[PDB]
Design a protein around this ligand. Sequence first.
Ligand SMILES: COc1cc(/C=C/CO)ccc1O
Ligand SMILES: COc1cc(/C=C/CO)ccc1O
Lengths: 356, 359
Amino acid sequence: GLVPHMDAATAVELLDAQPQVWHHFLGYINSMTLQCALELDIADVIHRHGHPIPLNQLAAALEIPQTKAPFLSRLMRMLVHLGYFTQVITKPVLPSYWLAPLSRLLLKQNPYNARSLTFCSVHEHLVDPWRQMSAWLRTGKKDTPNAFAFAHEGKKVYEVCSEDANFSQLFSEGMAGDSWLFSRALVSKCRDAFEGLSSLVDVGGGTGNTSKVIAETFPNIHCTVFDLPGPKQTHPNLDYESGNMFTDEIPHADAVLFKWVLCDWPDEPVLKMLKQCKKALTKGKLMIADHVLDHESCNDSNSMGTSLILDMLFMSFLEGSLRTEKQWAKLFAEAGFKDYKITPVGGLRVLIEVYP
Amino acid sequence: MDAATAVELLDAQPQVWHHFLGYINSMTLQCALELDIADVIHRHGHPIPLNQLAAALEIPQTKAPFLSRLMRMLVHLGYFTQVITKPVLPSYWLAPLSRLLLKQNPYNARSLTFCSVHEHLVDPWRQMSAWLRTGKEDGKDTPNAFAFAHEGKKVYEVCSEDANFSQLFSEGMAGDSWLFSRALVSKCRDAFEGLSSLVDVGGGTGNTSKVIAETFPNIHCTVFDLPHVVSGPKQTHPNLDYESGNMFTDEIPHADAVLFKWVLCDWPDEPVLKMLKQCKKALTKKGKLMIADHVLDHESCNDSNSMGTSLILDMLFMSFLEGSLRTEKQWAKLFAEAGFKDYKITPVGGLRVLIEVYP
Ligand SMILES: COc1cc(/C=C/CO)ccc1O
Ligand SMILES: COc1cc(/C=C/CO)ccc1O
């Protein structure tokens, strides 16, 4: 507890390095300010106004008392920096706010909005286990598959979802929203990968957002969503079968699609399932719509940072990871597949076609 | 919606993901500190293989693959490096940023990190929207979300109840002052010319005043802070001493210069103005006011990265303190209302500047 040389140049360098560290450890402030913006329906209230909205009118619409309007102003300034909104001053300080392009992803009226995924991701269920991550890392085989289970009395995310209907709904809605956008990019960027197919099984396809878009875009593909037992998407060439992809036989088709599924699981069950696909597809192909971590299409620093953040998220609450091409290729080889082709799609993700 | 628009939106989505997953940065860095990774690697003295690192951290070899993934994250963040040994089994070393993580360095950021990610500071954010919607007519309002989420208790009261949390905060401030003061006396040497005395209001355990006193032998430095803050180990020097009191309600010691380093940002305009008026009167009984703090819109912190961090601090302070990061306009207004006649801003670093304010 008692009190403990450096030249000025070094002191200044280190002083100027500190804010990078502050920015990292205060990262949760981004999470929480964005959540507030969603709780308050800020984007929707601004959109509804129809043109830039003055701070006082924004506060009134948000049921924020005028005494607290200066705090709202500061929250808005944060959200403007993050890229969601713009601000201007038309009175010679009352700003007026409008929408920036990134706010398209916040608007309730857009079926691709990220609201539910945001609420899910910042939920106590997903944040809290991180305070036991170090203890979990230090636990030998009191062990659990991940930090999430470690902090939930041994319960994996599937079990917690069955107990927490709200949390479960958020997760489901978040996946559906992503599928809305991803599928549309997929059928455009990878049109060639669907040519010549007459059937496809969408493993883990849920309410059918991915298959709906595939069926609409390629009218000769009979799509079957295969998943564990709201209303599901309707289309004449879209149907549904129930089953466990690990223990039940996957429906036969010209292509087996895994969209954001294999990343949830470790090598041993994935390999076992891939081998079963190998036996079944012999002759069709595997279609994996997921992350290839080191791929050229997502190798910029910002993209890599977000990929690694996802790898950490997945490490904490799922049983998988974001695999590199080398890791994928090793799984394909051991599963008996002979060839593969990667086509970039977007959103940190690609299509891998795998041939048996 | 056409394909081009769908792809554009798909490629924009990870920006939002990165925002809402910001707490992952907070928690992975906290893990690195809990596990003492920087010091373990430093003690090893050369790059350390993954298996040896797991052993050194008391992580079972069975969980080494998870450690590898945590390290990959931390390497991206810039704390560590992976030293390539072959054209698998990664070896890890230290990056320059890790200097701020090492326990042996008096300027390390460990305590501030632990303080900042603590439940006390994170949890009130889950009530921020409710607090923003609370009016002053139900008896439920509080000065900030922190108090709203702590049964009305401000951070000062929670610190008085939570000795560990309090110690983290104080150590955090001291570490920053160690660096900031050394930058201050170099980049703003002329600001100290001609002074015979200085009072460091909120100067804590004396890291700022110690450096001033050593660098400028004519300046008698007095740290003025709360009794409990100045009753323990602190910097000592023959021209440095400590006086105790409350800056809001007790008379601030007389000096040629009154210094506020990262203090006025904690408080709103009404008490700050009152205090500045008291200083104006004292400094013309001419002395000067010295404010070492953020000027939000200063050129030295205008880059996107710096502004992002400044706004994050502005949010942090909104949640648990009663202040903000002021713009030049806001500062200038305070100085005018307090009766000062001139000012000069000189950049120091760490998002902050020195404002000299003259009566
Ligand atoms: C629950 O939060 C998230 C989950 C995923 C999961 C993708 C595939 O299982 C991706 C991003 C998130 O923010
Ligand atoms: C408790 O966490 C923090 C507090 C401050 C306070 C500075 C002046 O009062 C600055 C940065 C932090 O991370």
